[PDB]
């Protein structure tokens, strides 16, 4: 686990850090797409009124 | 020398002493470990009458049985003139009477018969607990019998008091408590659609299937040269799983209790809170996941 930073060594293995990075990047991209979609949907038809 | 095996087979040629049944009974029969022996310091009846054990709860139970049988036969031969057991009609008091009893009015002997039957059942349960304590055993048989006794108690005590009329009790007549069952099932129409009745039916069917499979499994390896692993290999080729020697009995016990428990819950709930099991399911088509998704005869 020599690639894990010092703070998170007692929790993360060396193979799980890469998967965690992939998951974090995927979640951030999904959040960006979701905010864009919600803005477009509100511009189309407001659901609050 | 021929040794008779417990299965009844005799084989030519370990602690396999062929011993009578008297020695086993004499070794294990010791006095003074029942429930009442702990409470009063002594069991008033701590003896055996033939093969039966007569404890403090055996006398109460026998009194209850005798009184119940006498009161049952009095109402059905006298006060009805039927003279046949298949056409007598032992009914509780009318619903207009309320929760109070009256010796002058009809339906009085139904009350005494029901009370005596309840006393006898409770005494039987306590006597089983006593006998289980005397043998250093577990308390599982009393648990099962208590489940069925609670099933009895729900129908004749709790439901009538909750409804509040005391005429809400099934008559104690052969081929006539079926009449009460049929009329109660149709007043709350589609008793099939009661969710807890279906669970009871499912557990009953599973109990029958499990019992028959266990009997077949045990009988199939009775009197052959087997390595004690053949039945597991059979049960793993078919169905791809074997449960083990101790797992099956636990399953049987648990299912047998659960079926009657769910049935008593369903009957009690049908008595008081719901009036129509068809209207109970009216919420399914109205949840906010399917409301506007259909058209014509297909929309609800």
């Amino acid at each position: 686990n020599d690639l894990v930073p010092d703070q998170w060594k007692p929790l993360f293995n060396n193979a799980q850090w890469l998967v965690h990075d992939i998951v974090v990047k995927t979640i951030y991209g999904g959040l960006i797409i979701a905010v864009i979609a919600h803005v477009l949907c509100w511009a189309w038809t407001p659901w609050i009124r | 020398r021929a040794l008779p095996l417990p299965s009844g087979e005799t084989l030519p040629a370990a602690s396999a002493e062929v011993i009578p049944f008297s020695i086993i009974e004499e070794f294990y029969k010791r006095p003074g470990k029942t429930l009442a022996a702990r409470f009063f310091g002594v069991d008033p009846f701590d003896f055996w009458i033939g093969r039966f054990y007569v404890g403090l709860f055996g006398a109460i139970s026998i009194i209850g049985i005798i009184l119940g049988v006498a009161f049952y036969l009095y109402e059905g031969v006298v006060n009805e003139g039927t003279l046949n057991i298949l056409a007598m009609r032992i009914e509780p008091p009318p619903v207009s009477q309320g929760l109070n009893v009256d010796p002058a009015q009809p339906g009085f002997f139904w009350f005494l018969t029901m009370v005596a039957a309840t006393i006898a059942f409770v005494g039987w349960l306590l006597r089983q607990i006593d006998i289980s304590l005397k043998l250093d055993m577990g308390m599982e048989v009393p648990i099962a019998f208590g489940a069925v006794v609670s099933s009895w108690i729900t129908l004749q005590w709790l439901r009538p008091i909750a409804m509040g009329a005391w005429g809400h009790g099934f008559p104690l007549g052969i081929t006539h408590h079926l009449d009460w069952v049929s009329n109660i099932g149709y007043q709350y129409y589609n008793f099939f659609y009661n969710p807890f009745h279906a669970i009871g039916i499912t557990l009953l069917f599973a109990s029958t299937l499990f019992l028959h499979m266990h009997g077949s499994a045990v009988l199939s390896e009775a009197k052959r040269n087997i390595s004690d692993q053949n039945i597991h290999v059979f049960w793993r080729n078919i169905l791809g799983y074997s449960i083990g020697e101790i797992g099956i009995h636990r399953v049987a016990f648990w299912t047998g209790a659960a079926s009657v428990l769910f049935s008593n819950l369903c009957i009690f709930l049908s008595g008081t809170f719901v009036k129509d099991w068809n209207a109970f399911w009216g919420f399914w088509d109205k949840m906010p996941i399917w409301n506007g998704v259909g058209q014509g005869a297909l929309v609800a």
Binding site: - | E140, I143, G146, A147, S150, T154, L158, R159, I161, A162, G164, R250, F253, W254, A257, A258, L261, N264, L265, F268, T272, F273
Partner: protein, 32 residues
């Protein structure tokens, strides 16, 4: 009253359910 006694009988009905849950808990716990 109409509802208090009914709720009490409901409690009594569930007290019947409890003993078998006790056996399940004993079987689960006592193995280890």
């Amino acid at each position: 009253m109409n509802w208090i006694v009914a709720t009490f009988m409901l409690m009594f009905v569930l007290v019947a359910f409890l003993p078998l849950v006790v056996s399940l808990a004993y079987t689960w716990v006592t193995n280890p």
